[PDB]
Subunit: 308 residues, 4 copies
């Protein structure tokens, strides 16, 4: 069977194990720094297997040796934000955690595809690629799938249609300057502008950018995990099943969109080899302007990163 | 449980029972004019239930009384074409069969949504609405979902991407003058023209229009059933689960696109109440020209219909 | 669509919503007394729908009016236990909570099947039946499905076989005195005693009885929720899809197994009408002695309850 | 991705592809000797993928070279029987077909697990093992899963319970002499004898034995394929996902049940390595007498085979 290791067994990591288990994609290893917690969550989920009918070994551990030879490594060990904070405010604590986790896991699974989740996403993904030394196509960050999912959900709710018929591309860094692309969003191939008024669509674009913060303010003691885990699981599935999915993920740019040496949310074809192709869309002046402002925000986090 | 009756237990009807059973949407009644055949197919499929794990009663019958109080009626009793024929060539034989089936089933399930499949689709759907006297929104024809699925498949194959990320709208009568709409087709919200060259996309549009005939010429003894059944099942699912799907189905027009008193392949929101809304797309001159040529072909079949 | 209301949006409640949404069984209403929490978890789960592909309306609320006319009501509002604590220790606190919830929800959904989860399970289910005034067969408690799932997981691990081929019955109150039944345990119809030696099987039985405590000790801050939620969801599903599942649940007894006027873990047929029939197994002397011991335990908590 | 080759694109073969595609287990290659037929069914099934949402490459062919390096090979190229005919009557025709297929496919996929379906099952599986020269544990026949499924369906119908809670073992050759085992039949761990009276259970056992004939008489033009295909697919799945399923299949015996040098229906653990272990049930006098009768039947066909 395929092997998937999830580093960090908190809200997002455990929920990610849940989505993956139900899919019977492969055996799962939940690792954490806290003793007992990952073992308990993995056993609890494993005990659900006879009810749901999936044959997947789910095991909790505190030892990186158990993650050896994984096909995919998911990183969800970062600290989450609380109300009033930005994802960037977590960069110091999480840079340390990320370096720690990647330095230990990466060497044990040299052929794995690493999927970063820790925030600030784009910067943490860059760090992981550096600490691991893995081919850039095998180190990606999850962010766009979740952001576009929030957008797609708001459209479905607004238009009163099935979430199964809404598609949307969203680019940029996983933050406030995120760039949802209405012009690149459709319902069964039909432009969303044909279903929703411009002013209303504008409010949806804004709600999408502040979507993470909306949940943080509701939960008050933590951030989102159901959709984030689903998004991560979808990317894991893309790799394990070599589905060649077209989705936005933080990938390493070498000139696309006029950007070099940076991890940025861009449309890619994701498969068994990780990022198999970075797509270069014909954005207009307004879109490019928003994208550049996003690339600037991301570069800003990378500059903070290098000063740590 | 919900009840679904499938009139005509041949290739498309039985395959449709298969797709539906696996979804555990409701009990299924397979009716046919031939004795034994529907009973055998329904029992064979029912015996697969312990293996797959679905609890759905699947029963074969030769008596319309068994289809009483169905939530959805699927009609697949028409004769299929052989190599060298057009769907229109079946209108005489199938007009009789359709009238026969609808006159018997419709009265027994007054609250059902009828989904026609018999070819020529648009004309047979018009006939069914007339013979049944049901509210027009509850009498629809399956055709666009299948046509757009063939198109979406060719795009996925051509672009080398996941079929899960391809969306496409296709309009018109279910025939040679069918109108696939490249401008209304995307991959994760991105126009298909960004993935495929115009000349290649043109060949795909053509293959889509002649897609049914392609299979007929390969099988030689019959026509397609796997995709047609999937398409039909998806529409059944849309109604039973009130999913508000946006898909192209033959619906009754009263002025949309400048067309009145005709069943034509158009984009609709499909739910528990059947067609809950007919969408009017801003087609350009070239598209409207193709659509009108299609509306003309359909009107031609309706004129043949009235002379029977 | 069917409507499911979950009272108590904590670990089990929210996780049950997750399992339920993935099955697209109906719209879900997550209610809690803490403001924002349910709204946040519901929105988060909702935003995952475009990724997973399920059309389910998940709404969080602090108002019981929103639960009106539900097909099923799940009660997961009770306080969980902390390490070194027995489920019975929660009786006073959870009796007040359970009473408050049932009294506000029952009147608004008179035709609903109530599934209790709050511990001590058996006594809370009884309290629910008494507060709702509902037909006894429409007020049941989840416990046996979870306990049996743990038991099945253990034997699957021990024997090295698929969890899909392991079934087992388990009876009694949800506590240390529960009674797993090895004699009524099989692997593809074959007695488990053929796969696991008596000594090891005895250990598995003991682990099952202490299974809940095992998780609480590992997590230290709370109790299990992945399997507990999957169990609750399988019961909700049995009801909504009228599957006629044969499973152990807490049902009201009037003489079965020689027990009367008590909610106790017994095998039943679960369907749209709730408990449609209580099965009466031919237990031997060994098993009955265990069952009677468990009954005395449940009776004791019932005595504590009636005296609160 | 995993690769599955189906030799014989008829009713069972094509239907197996359908069940397999829906599970997204791997790419499927449908091979047939008749030109166009496999290509047509494959394309048709492929065109259904955008509707169902599975990324599976289904290719039809008339060239064995395309089956090279498959993980699993399904053999469904045998001629089916017509009413008033026994499965044994197909031995000469199907021996030539089976021989021709195996000799061309085996060499190209030396690491594959071969699953025989052609009737007479037991004798064809033996012939396959002898022609391929493969390890006996990697050449098995489908029969018991189907027979047991029918038996389980009947008891589910009779008892009025979910097909998900019914398990049963069945042994022996795939024919009139097959041996269902009521003693090794349970409903959620409870003996079926507790649900169905002896007289009725005896009728169910008889129906199971004649189950295949029942379908052939109803269809008149061919034999079953929905359950047969689901059975074959569950076995393919057990192998590809290394599930360790406990199921009856035709395996090579070297003394188990006192039988040697014969492929016979026995319970096994099925996983990535094929038959990983043959279970030896403690059968009583009644059961062994039946098993020995069945063994003599299979041996007889084996005698006919070796003398062809
Ligand atoms: N779209 C996205 O990219 C996205 C979405 C949601 C959350 N996130 C981010 O993901 C991270 C996880 O969020 P969460 O809510 O699951 O948090 P959490 O606090 O629930 O879980 C993090 C887990 O990591 C563990 N941990 C800490 N240091 C570790 C180390 N060195 N090694 C192994 N495990 C360690 C903790 O003990 C904890 O169980 C946060 O940084 C959050 O902001 C990103
Ligand atoms: N996209 C579409 O709309 C679409 C796709 C595929 C096929 N079709 C059409 O659907 C029909 C069915 O195709 P098929 O391949 O399943 O054909 P088929 O010949 O396999 O099956 C038709 C079944 O109808 C039964 N039948 C005939 N008269 C009947 C009557 N009066 N009452 C009840 N049953 C009766 C037959 O006995 C037969 O079993 C054809 O007309 C075909 O062209 C439409
Ligand atoms: N029967 C079983 O098999 C089983 C399995 C697991 C847990 N349980 C029990 O289920 C209960 C819930 O466990 P948990 O881990 O989810 O706990 P939790 O503390 O995470 O969640 C309980 C939720 O109830 C809410 N709540 C409290 N009073 C309320 C009221 N009056 N109305 C509405 N909501 C209210 C809280 O605010 C909280 O969100 C516990 O009593 C636990 O012991 C039973
Ligand atoms: N073991 C079971 O439980 C079970 C269940 C059902 C059917 N069967 C048996 O399975 C076989 C297939 O049944 P069916 O209903 O699908 O039959 P079918 O006639 O529909 O299909 C057989 C296919 O094999 C093809 N074929 C013939 N010779 C070939 C060769 N040399 N190479 C490649 N393809 C070749 C045919 O052209 C045809 O498409 C029969 O022998 C039947 O008795 C076994
Ligand atoms: O807002 C957060 O902190 C986490 C969810 C996200 O990254 O969108
Ligand atoms: O071509 C046919 O006759 C049937 C398939 C379709 O209607 O596309
Ligand atoms: O032990 C607990 O408190 C919860 C899980 C269970 O009831 O098994
Ligand atoms: O009876 C037949 O020929 C095929 C079905 C089976 O083998 O059961």
């Amino acid at each position: 069977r395929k092997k998937i290791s999830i580093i960090g067994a908190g809200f997002v990591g455990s929920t990610t194990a849940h989505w993956l288990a139900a899919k019977e994609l492969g055996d799962i290893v939940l690792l954490d720094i806290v003793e007992g917690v990952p073992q308990g969550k993995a056993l609890d989920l494993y005990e659900a297997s006879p009810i749901e009918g999936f044959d997947v070994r789910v095991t909790g551990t505190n030892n990186y040796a158990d993650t050896a030879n994984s096909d995919v490594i998911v990183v969800t060990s970062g600290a989450p934000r609380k109300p009033g904070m930005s994802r960037e405010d977590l960069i110091k604590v999480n840079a340390d955690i990320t370096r720690a986790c990647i330095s230990q896991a990466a060497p044990l699974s040299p052929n794995a595809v690493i999927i970063m989740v820790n925030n600030p996403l784009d910067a943490m993904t860059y760090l992981a690629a550096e600490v691991s030394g893995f081919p850039k196509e095998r180190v990606i960050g999850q962010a766009g799938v979740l952001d576009a999912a929030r957008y797609r959900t708001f459209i479905a709710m607004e238009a009163g249609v099935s979430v199964e018929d809404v598609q949307a591309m969203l680019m940029g860094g996983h933050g406030d300057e995120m760039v949802p692309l209405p012009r690149f969003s459709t319902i069964s191939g039909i432009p969303v502008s044909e279903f929703i008024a411009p002013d209303r669509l504008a409010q949806i674009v804004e709600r999408t950018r502040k979507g993470g913060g909306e949940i943080v303010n509701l939960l008050k003691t933590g951030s989102a995990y159901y959709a984030p885990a689903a998004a991560t699981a979808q990317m894991v599935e893309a790799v394990l099943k070599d589905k060649k999915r077209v989705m936005p993920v933080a990938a390493y740019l070498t000139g696309q969109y006029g950007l070099n040496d940076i991890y940025f949310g861009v449309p890619v074809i994701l498969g068994a080899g990780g990022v198999e192709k970075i797509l270069e869309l014909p954005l207009n002046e307004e879109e490019m302007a928003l994208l550049n402002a996003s690339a600037k925000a991301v570069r800003a986090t990378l500059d903070t990163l290098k000063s740590l």
